[PDB]
Amino acid sequence: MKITVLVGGVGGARFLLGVQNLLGLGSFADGPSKHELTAVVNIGDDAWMHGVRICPDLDTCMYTLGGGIGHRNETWNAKEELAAYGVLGDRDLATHLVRSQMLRAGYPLSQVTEALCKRWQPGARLLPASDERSETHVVITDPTDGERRAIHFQEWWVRYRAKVPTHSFAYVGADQATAGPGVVEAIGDADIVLLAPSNPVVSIGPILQIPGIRGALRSTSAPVIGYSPIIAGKPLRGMADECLKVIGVESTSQAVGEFFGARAGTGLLDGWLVHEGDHAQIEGVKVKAVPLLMTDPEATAAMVRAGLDLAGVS
Amino acid sequence: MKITVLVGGVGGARFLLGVQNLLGLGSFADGPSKHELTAVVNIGDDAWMHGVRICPDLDTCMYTLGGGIDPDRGWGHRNETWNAKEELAAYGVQPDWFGLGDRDLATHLVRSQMLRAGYPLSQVTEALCKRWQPGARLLPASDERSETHVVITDPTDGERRAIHFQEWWVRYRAKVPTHSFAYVGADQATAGPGVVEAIGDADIVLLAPSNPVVSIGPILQIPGIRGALRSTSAPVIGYSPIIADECLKVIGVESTSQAVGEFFGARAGTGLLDGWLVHEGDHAQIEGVKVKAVPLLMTDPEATAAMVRAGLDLAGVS
Ligand SMILES: C=C(OP(=O)(O)OC[C@@H](O)[C@@H](O)[C@@H](O)Cn1c2nc(=O)[nH]c(=O)c-2cc2ccc(O)cc21)C(=O)O
Ligand SMILES: [Ca+2]
Ligand SMILES: [Ca+2]
């Protein structure tokens, strides 16, 4: 009755909704449930900004599973004034103010998250991958002086991506971080561990740079089942993932599967799901093609079922 | 050439509008500015709230002189929304009684980020004023902490507690048994950059008709500021706030121009005033202080411009 999922980005949050739909959790509950879902949540996008601590992946899971997905009725008047001062919705800022106060009074991020969830009641345990800072950065050639300069991922994404040469990612602080409370336990004790179809480099990937988490994944007796984020069939055949490009990995199910690789070798996957019509073959890894479009929590629920079935879990 | 005004509250800001209009400064400018205006701004109401630093008197002056103030309220931003406040309420946090508007929050966010990065309040204020262009130099009375505290009897339990001015004024509206004010940090607070110099080098110093106990009084508790006032060569002219009642009660001062004037007292003795302006039809007689009754209603920037002219004329300054 124990599922743990590694997640980041909007697609991680939508994947969790499907897990809840399958298992009758949170907004999809009728009578209080038998199963428990644990999300190990990317912190690589987290940043101190305008004096406040912003945790995007934790907030997106929390709002999404809490029914508040940014927000509804959102205004950006504070954001407007900030631009007028020459430098983030109004409701969003409330979350940031409360979190920053708890962090400055010594609550770890895992406890901060738990406190915020009393109000959102997401119906899942949302564990930060670490309580220490581990901030994804991007090394660019800065055009002002031609220097290789490390930029926070959120600034790269909005300002520099596709406009300057981009060389690599750096996980600033990962080496000094430890797995957050309960993370290693959630991975070791699960009936099954799922890699949600998030960006492999900057949503799942940074979770894997936190000392201890890759070890737990390699050694856990739980089946580890990954979901491909590559969807073929779009108009003009889609576009390559920009973050995979930075590390020179093609935007294919085959290439992302080898990125995680096989637990039987030195990698992370027992199972790899690809979208219908797609193909991959990876020694030691059971690959299966099934619908992987998160149209709605009901279609995501079928996706989660395919992962359980592939892993032989009830 | 040089005017220094001590200010606190909405009335301080409006008095500063009167000065600018008289002298062609800020939004009232038409042609080259001949004068410079410096405000020494109370910091006694400043509080940390929800992790950000609120400086109400500095913001009231900045917003008013820069055209962003709310007219109905006299504090905070115009065209304000309260979505972040409502959301704070939905999280069930305290304090739930201080109004932190969305637009106003940006000011507090920038200020707090700068203060925590090591910038002193005077430079933060200068940074924020690059956007508002108030047309006056807004000097925090101190860059250090000096906060007004209130000793009350708590109604929940009949115990004596001390609370910040903000809880007294906004949360209880002073409807609680109140026994004394305490200027915590005043004795340890150095006069802020430029403050003593602006008082020493002024052609005239004006005491705005702000709250005498909680707006002008706290500035006087900063040890260097009161000293500069006693020794500056400039005439010091005060404006009666009586034409606030709770604050005078707590300290046992009657609510009259004569009494408030004596609260500040005469420079000739141990006081601070050279002169004292009261509303027309008011008589006040204080030894060593030239008193003149003139219209003292800050109806509009040139009603006040005329109030300022009467102050210069009482001082004999041109
Ligand atoms: C009357 C005089 O003094 P003064 O006008 O400062 O009174 C206190 C108040 O204005 C100020 O200290 C502050 O409290 C005003 N003020 C609020 N006042 C309220 O009553 N309720 C509120 O929610 C509220 C929120 C708020 C937020 C930011 C801010 O910068 C000021 C704010 C005078 O000297 O002439
Ligand atoms: Ca509460
Ligand atoms: Ca000091």
From Swiss-Prot, chain A:
Chain sites annotated for binding 7,8-didemethyl-8-hydroxy-5-deazariboflavin? D59
Q: Identify the Pfam families for this entry.
A: CofD (PF01933)
* Reactions this protein catalyses: enolpyruvoyl-2-diphospho-5'-guanosine + 7,8-didemethyl-8-hydroxy-5-deazariboflavin = dehydro coenzyme F420-0 + GMP + H(+)
Q: Name one GO molecular function term.
A: LPPG:FO 2-phospho-L-lactate transferase activity
Q: Which cofactor does it need?
A: Mg(2+)
Can the keyword Magnesium be found in this entry's annotation? Answer: yes
Q: Which Gene3D superfamilies match?
A: CofD-like domain, CofD-like domains
Enzyme class, top EC level, equals: transferase
Part of which pathway? Cofactor biosynthesis; coenzyme F420 biosynthesis
User: Coiled-coil regions in this chain?
Assistant: none
Could you tell me the EC number(s) of this protein? 2.7.8.28
Q: Which UniProt keywords apply?
A: Magnesium, Transferase
Question: Which InterPro entries does the annotation name?
Answer: CofD, CofD-like_dom_sf, FbiA/CofD
Protein role: Catalyzes the transfer of the phosphoenolpyruvate moiety from enoylpyruvoyl-2-diphospho-5'-guanosine (EPPG) to 7,8-didemethyl-8-hydroxy-5-deazariboflavin (FO) with the formation of dehydro coenzyme F420-0 and GMP.
How this chain assembles, per its entry, is:
Homodimer.
- Entry's HAMAP family? CofD
Similarity remark? Belongs to the CofD family.
Q: Would you tell me the protein name for this molecule?
A: Phosphoenolpyruvate transferase
Q: Which organism is it from?
A: Mycolicibacterium smegmatis (strain ATCC 700084 / mc(2)155)
Tell me the name of the encoding gene.
fbiA
Swiss-Prot record, chain B:
Q: Which cofactor does it need?
A: Mg(2+)
Which pathway is this protein engaged in? Cofactor biosynthesis; coenzyme F420 biosynthesis
One Pfam family linked to the record: CofD
Q: What is this protein called?
A: Phosphoenolpyruvate transferase
Species of provenance: Mycolicibacterium smegmatis (strain ATCC 700084 / mc(2)155)
- Claim: Magnesium is one of the keywords in the record: yes
Residues forming coiled coils: none
Q: Gene of origin?
A: fbiA
According to the record's subunit comment, the protein's assembly and interactions are: Homodimer.
| Record keywords, A-Z | Magnesium, Transferase
Q: Which residues make up the binding site for 7,8-didemethyl-8-hydroxy-5-deazariboflavin? A: D59
